[PDB]
């Protein structure tokens, strides 16, 4: 109540320093009830001035001052100058106006999206200040939709300036915390849009197996149910909740076989053609709802109707759960209208993920992204992209840019969805981007030619394709410890640069680069390779400090801009010296945790990992060349210790310290092995490498090796040969 | 009233199984009046069913669900699922919102359109429904606006599925059938704007005459009136209704002339800046209306008024009339603006319409299009066309996609209006269409160059002009017959492939391909020849069946799509093995009705063809070999039978039969002698030339000879030769 201040027929709420509510009420009754968006309204005092005189209001905190001259909100009326110069005149909110420098946010799906489409606002602005409206519906105390709020106007001032993170956790505590998500979501999916049989289906899962694929979930999409066998005086087989009795005989069985494997059992749902007379469930629905039977009375999709809600829930999904389905594939692509004027798929998100919590601990759901707030619903499901190179170049910055509305765990289909073009470079590109993303499911629409098997592709891309793979359940224990960030403190697994560096300029110049956890960042490449350097490429951007590979350990100077050069079968992901990574032993082994730990240290400076899990926190230590792990509790877990290039100690149980100040810290990595590869591969003529080669070893002062790699006519071949004498100085 | 069903504020009646209108009426009073679109609402009656509720009504018909909520009409309120599964979830028509799948209709007009321009929708899908809302004026019982209806909103939602001609049917039965033409507006017309002479004018006439071209109108562009003479106080010389004496000493003599040739005679009306004081009609105007004569005051034009509409037609169309104007070219370009809120074009082409009846039987304007229901009103009249070869590629499509809101006679200006640029292959392909059109009416802006005459272009151009002039005559019995086709049974003479083929995809995919009455399939060259040909071409889809061209008889056996090539002076026009066509045999001979006819047949099948007349119908008929012609009454006329290649019967009178099993079917059309003419005209190498001859000679195997032309170095020459090989297998 100190912290809230009425003036004519407004209210402000000073929530923190740098967050403020703004509401009009033409009835003086101001809205306490939690909307769509809103969850939380309770914040620790804060110290704030105000001027207030007969007209006018003025609010003062550490960063904003906050104007308000009475009557309706206007642009005149009601306006904000931020306490801060990153901008010469773009400091001002005005009501109802937007201002340069929005960092931007999200969307609701990139279906049918061929590369880059627009994007929603999101709260981050390089000029410090954002407003996000509340234009929500208000809820009861249980969560359901009450109707309009009585605050007409409800809008939230962000004023943070380039405190990107904490906007970002006060966004959290405002909306709700994104719940924790189960460690298997953060395996590799399996899905395709086919008409699998049971016996096909479980003959892949095998095969995945076979090939040292490991797999977390089984996705069935829709030809799981009657398609063409749906009589066409009920229209489509688009939705559907009767299994094909053909292809499923036994689908108990079937998720039992699928459960055997340790695997995750999800549907596809199109709800928006409901519940109709040929359905296997109808009869018990029609019964509930009271319908016209003879008449073949459609229960008809209607998400504000809280007895079709039960009917959906507990006649329609509950059998499916009863055969053993673990969590729903919502795929709702028919629009945003409703009775209530709430977003179908908002009721479907807000009311599927609290559901799902009935039978499973921390369950999902896989929907499309359903406004500010729809964070309490993961995973965000992307759709329907276009396989193309433009929709991969698009995907890293769609990716890193949602953090900033707090949308925080994408799943794209790994490779497109559908339409588009093959590549089997593509292909492989999207699958080492999709690997160092929030979730990896591979996915492709009905083509008999887009399946994303490793082994649909010639016998270098599979073997890379499975590589990438196995890396994903390698990554699982890094990926879950981020997922326990992301639930309790707020902090996004993938970050923009400009959240850890908001004052390089660069930070906001390399849109597809992201930072991967803590430890690592990431520069996908997206680009088809140059044919004659037979190698893709992309411009990194190095902060501060001496960065490895994380694959090759070659080494980085910074601060540097350097275009960086990688094989198809190479992906640019870069550690600082100190880091710490923990990888899986055996990514193969199916173990609920891991029995075994790889300690992945890089070199040259102090740093420290605490691995959160499920029952355990294990912190890893590396000071003044000391390595040390500890856990909260003991466990029977082997411990390697990998330091730089050498296992230094293999399976050690229990908690345990070791000096590595007397131990190799050099990678392997060295120019002259590199520089041979790099010409060795390229499509250049032999008088050029052999003439390269010769002078790179002869020439022995670094500014006359450059001097020399100056003069080549190849362009492309001078910043590739660039790249390595920049590791190599 | 069975068919009627009111709920909450909301009237809907079931006209058909496919076809219901939907009101609403905040005063409780629903329209019965007819409106400027809907002259009938009396439909036979239909079953369905209801479902109806306390606050829900469900109408449920053959094809489609209706469902209203209550309250205001709202995308959430209103809304229907068809019975269809054309697609996967476009299947529900939302109030106020758009589906995918409308196949459109047409617009306003073509003026200053350089090739396509946009079309608003019509009453066809491919996914089945439409929505054609009612936003016009009531009508009083003799036709005059009343104002506003008490029905609000007034929608008629079509859910015919594919059934595209019985949905054209019932959308004529709700807003009136097409009215029958007059033979004479079938033949050839004479338009250019250009300042004649009654000499210089009968002297174009004449040589039309000596040049063995027919016509049937003769336009005169509105230099007829004054122009340049119209002192600049008035305005422009735009409009005008005085004849410039100069050019038109005695215009009852001079129409006196055209009517003695046999020609029915339209003036341009330019009627937007109403009745000046300087017009010969302005003094009996100026009584009638009580105007300021000392002050000049105009008779400004106000087509809402009684009183002017009357002066219009009595004192100044009268006089004009009396002097021997059979018709009036409305030629509106100057807005929808009025006080009652109808369009000036609506008002002037829905009363000028009227009062063309009262002094000829059957006649017509020519005038824009004016919304849906002004198909009552032809002809169409598509105005000032870019001469391009953009413009003619779009007016194939343009003329079918038409008959989708049943506008089934527009007249374009044959070889496109104004600006563009030469090509006298342009003008012979656009004349080749307009044969094949509606109405064949040649017209060219004001320009010294643009004149249409055939003796403008070179020997060549000019003889291919002239045989197609005297074909559209030739073709004038089959095109009345399919005019009293149109009238009485609601059938377009120009039909989209998917009305005949609605199920066949390749039906969607030729949007210039059309049907011409029952027994022609039309296939335009729209693009500028090959040079390296000497040929044009266009993908022609061939229907399942044997098809011959028309002129030649090379045959085709469907179903396929297959590039055809022509010289420019042929025309790619198609008629099915039974096919039966009657053609004037004296098409330059002045006489109401033909003295002649000749019975086309192409072999193959059976077939019949029905002869509407004025005064009689003949029917022939094709049944196992054996030729048939009856009529209702008895006649002189001769008729002539040609059996594929040859001419059977010369001039018999009378009812007759005739055995065809003994007579040669095949057409002379052979492989070699087309093969000898390409390879002749072609711009290639001789050497090609020589060897293509030789080999295609030598190779016994279809197979080979197609695997040799596989070879040819020349793309465009394969796709021609293998056109020949397809139709030679
Ligand atoms: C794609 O699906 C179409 C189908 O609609 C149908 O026409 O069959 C086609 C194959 O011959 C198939 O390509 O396009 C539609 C329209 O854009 C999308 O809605 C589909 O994506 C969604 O549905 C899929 C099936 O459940 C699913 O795999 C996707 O993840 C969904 O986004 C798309 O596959
Ligand atoms: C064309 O007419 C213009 C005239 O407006 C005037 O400027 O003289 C020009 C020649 O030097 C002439 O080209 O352009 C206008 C504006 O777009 C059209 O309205 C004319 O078309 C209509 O009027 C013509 C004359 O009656 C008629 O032949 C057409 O059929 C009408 O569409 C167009 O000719």
């Not at 829930?313 to 028919?334: M, R, S, T």
């Not at 289909?413 to 470079?425: C, N, T, V």
């Not at 992906?571 to 010296?577: L, R």
Request: some cysteine.
């Amino acid at each position: 109540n100190n912290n809230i201040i009425k003036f004519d027929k407004a209210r402000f709420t000073v929530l923190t320093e740098h967050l403020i509510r703004i509401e009009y009420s033409e009835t003086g009754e101001f809205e306490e009830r939690m909307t769509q968006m809103v969850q939380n309204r309770e914040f620790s005092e804060v110290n704030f001035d105000i001027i207030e005189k007969e007209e006018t209001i003025e609010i003062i905190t550490s960063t904003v001052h906050l104007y308000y001259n009475g009557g309706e909100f206007t642009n005149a009326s009601l306006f904000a100058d931020v306490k801060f110069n990153f901008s010469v005149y773009s400091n001002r909110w005005y009501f109802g106006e937007k201002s340069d420098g929005n960092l931007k946010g999200t969307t609701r799906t990139l279906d049918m999206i061929d590369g880059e489409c627009p994007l929603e606002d999101g709260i981050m602005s390089k000029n410090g200040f954002a407003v996000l409206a509340d234009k929500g519906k208000v809820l009861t105390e249980v969560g359901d939709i009450a109707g309009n709020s009585v605050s007409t106007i409800d809008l939230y001032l962000f004023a943070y300036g380039r405190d990107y993170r904490q906007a970002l956790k006060d966004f959290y505590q405002l909306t709700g915390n994104t719940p924790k998500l189960p460690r298997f979501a953060l395996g590799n999916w399996w899905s395709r849009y086919y008409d699998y049989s049971d016996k096909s289906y479980l003959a892949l899962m095998d095969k995945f197996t076979d090939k040292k694929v490991p797999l977390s979930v089984s996705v069935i999409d829709m030809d799981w149910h009657k398609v063409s066998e749906v009589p066409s005086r009920f229209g489509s087989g688009w939705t559907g909740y009767s299994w094909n009795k053909k292809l499923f005989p036994n689908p108990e069985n079937f998720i039992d076989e699928l459960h055997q494997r340790k695997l995750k059992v999800t549907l596809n749902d199109h709800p928006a053609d409901g519940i109709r007379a040929f359905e296997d469930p109808y009869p018990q629905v029609a019964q509930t709802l009271d319908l016209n039977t003879e008449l073949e009375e459609a229960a008809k999709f209607d998400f504000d109707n809280l007895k079709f809600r039960k009917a959906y829930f507990e006649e329609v999904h509950g059998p499916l759960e009863k055969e053993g389905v673990d969590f729903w594939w919502i795929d709702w692509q028919q629009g945003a209208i409703s009775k209530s004027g709430v977003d179908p798929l908002w009721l479907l998100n807000h009311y599927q993920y609290q559901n799902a919590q009935k039978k499973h601990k921390n369950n999902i759901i896989l929907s499309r992204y359903a406004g500010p707030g729809s964070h309490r619903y993961p995973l965000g499901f992307s759709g329907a992209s276009v396989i193309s190179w433009a929709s991969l170049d698009f995907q890293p910055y769609f990716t890193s840019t949602a953090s900033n509305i707090g949308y925080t765990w994408w799943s794209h289909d790994i490779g497109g969805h559908m339409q588009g073009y093959k590549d089997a470079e593509l292909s492989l590109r999207w699958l080492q981007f999709g690997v160092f993303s929030p979730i990896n499911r591979l996915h492709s629409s009905k083509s008999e030619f887009t399946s994303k098997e490793p082994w649909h592709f010639d016998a270098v891309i599979e073997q890379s394709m499975i590589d990438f793979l196995q890396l994903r359940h390698q990554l699982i224990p890094y990926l879950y410890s981020a997922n326990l960030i992301t639930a309790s403190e707020g902090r996004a697994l993938v970050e923009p640069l400009y959240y850890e560096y908001p004052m390089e300029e660069e930070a906001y110049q390399h849109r597809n680069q992201y930072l991967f956890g803590e430890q690592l960042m990431v520069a996908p490449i997206t680009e088809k390779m140059n044919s004659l350097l037979q190698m893709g490429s992309v411009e990194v951007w190095f902060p501060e400090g001496t960065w490895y590979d994380f694959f090759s350990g070659q080494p980085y100077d910074g601060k540097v801009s350097l275009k960086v050069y990688r094989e198809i079968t190479e992906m640019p992901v870069f550690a600082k010296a100190g880091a710490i990574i923990p990888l899986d032993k055996n990514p193969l082994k199916k173990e609920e945790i891991p029995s075994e730990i790889i300690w992945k240290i890089f070199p040259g400076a102090d740093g420290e990992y605490l691995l959160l899990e499920e029952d355990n926190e294990t912190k890893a230590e590396f000071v003044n060349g000391i390595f040390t792990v500890t856990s909260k509790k003991e466990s029977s877990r082997k411990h390697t210790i990998i330091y730089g290039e050498h296992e230094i100690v293999s399976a050690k149980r229990g908690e345990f310290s070791i000096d590595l100040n007397g131990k190799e810290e050099n990678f392997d990595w060295n120019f002259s092995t590199a520089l041979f590869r790099r010409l060795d591969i390229a499509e250049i003529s032999y008088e050029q490498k052999d003439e390269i080669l010769q002078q790179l070893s002869l020439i022995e002062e670094h500014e006359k090796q450059v001097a020399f790699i100056k003069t080549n006519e190849n362009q492309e071949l001078q910043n590739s040969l660039f790249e390595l004498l920049y590791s190599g100085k």
